[PDB]
Amino acid sequence: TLKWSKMNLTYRIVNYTPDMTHSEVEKAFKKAFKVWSDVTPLNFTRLHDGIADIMISFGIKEHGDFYPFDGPSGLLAHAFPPGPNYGGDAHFDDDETWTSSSKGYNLFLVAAHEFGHSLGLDHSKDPGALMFPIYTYTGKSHFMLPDDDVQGIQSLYG
Ligand SMILES: COc1ccc(S(=O)(=O)N(Cc2cccnc2)c2c(C)cccc2C(=O)NO)cc1
Ligand SMILES: [Ca+2]
Ligand SMILES: [Zn+2]
Numbered sequence: 757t758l759k760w761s762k763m764n765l766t767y768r769i770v771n772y773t774p775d776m777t778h779s780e781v782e783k784a785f786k787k788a789f790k791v792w793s794d795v796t797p798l799n800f801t802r803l804h805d806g807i808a809d810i811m812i813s814f815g816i817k818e819h820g821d822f823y824p825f826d827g828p829s830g831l832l833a834h835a836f837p838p839g840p841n842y843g844g845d846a847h848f849d850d851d852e853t854w855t856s857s858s859k860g861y862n863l864f865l866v867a868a869h870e871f872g873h874s875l876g877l878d879h880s881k882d883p884g885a886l887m888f889p890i891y892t893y894t895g896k897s898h899f900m901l902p903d904d905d906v907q908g909i910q911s912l913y914g
């Protein structure tokens with residue numbers, strides 16, 4: 757039902773958090789766009805400076821909102837629906853341990869999940885779908901959006 761009115765989108769990383777090196781964090785987001793861009797004609801462009809539609813940043817317990825985090829476990833990240841400048845935003849918990857290996861909460865698992873919500877997809881009930889309401893580790897070596905997600909994302913963007 758909710759979807760972007762244009763196939764052009766831009767994003768900007770506010771910070772890379774000291775939990776991982778910038779090179780490791782940059783590839784993590786690129787893999788997410790690659791997996792989603794594989795079955796969506798959406799075009800993602802990285803902006804060096806200025807304000808972008810989807811800005812990513814890492815916050816801490818208090819984050820100027822009536823939705824404080826509950827500590828390390830709990831809300832690993834959250835985003836707002838496809839709105840004007842405020843919408844399409846994405847925040848991450850800096851109090852958690854972000855790693856690219858199988859430890860704590862993998863950044864790619866949460867990153868891909870918020871993108872699914874920003875794409876207009878709702879939580880999926882299939883355990884193999886990334887939109888699964890429960891966090892689960894998966895082999896990112898050959899992981900591809902399952903048929904459930906492909907039929908849903910295609911049903912929205914075609
Ligand atoms: C795999 O990607 C993700 C991304 C976010 C989250 S999450 O913890 O924020 N998450 C799901 C959840 C998880 C375990 C127990 N209860 C709820 C949520 C939680 C905890 C609270 C409220 C909203 C969500 C949510 O759906 N955000 O998109 C979990 C997994
Ligand atoms: Ca939390
Ligand atoms: Zn936030």
Ligand SMILES: [Zn+2]
Nearest residue numbers: 869873879889
């Ligand atoms: Zn969710």
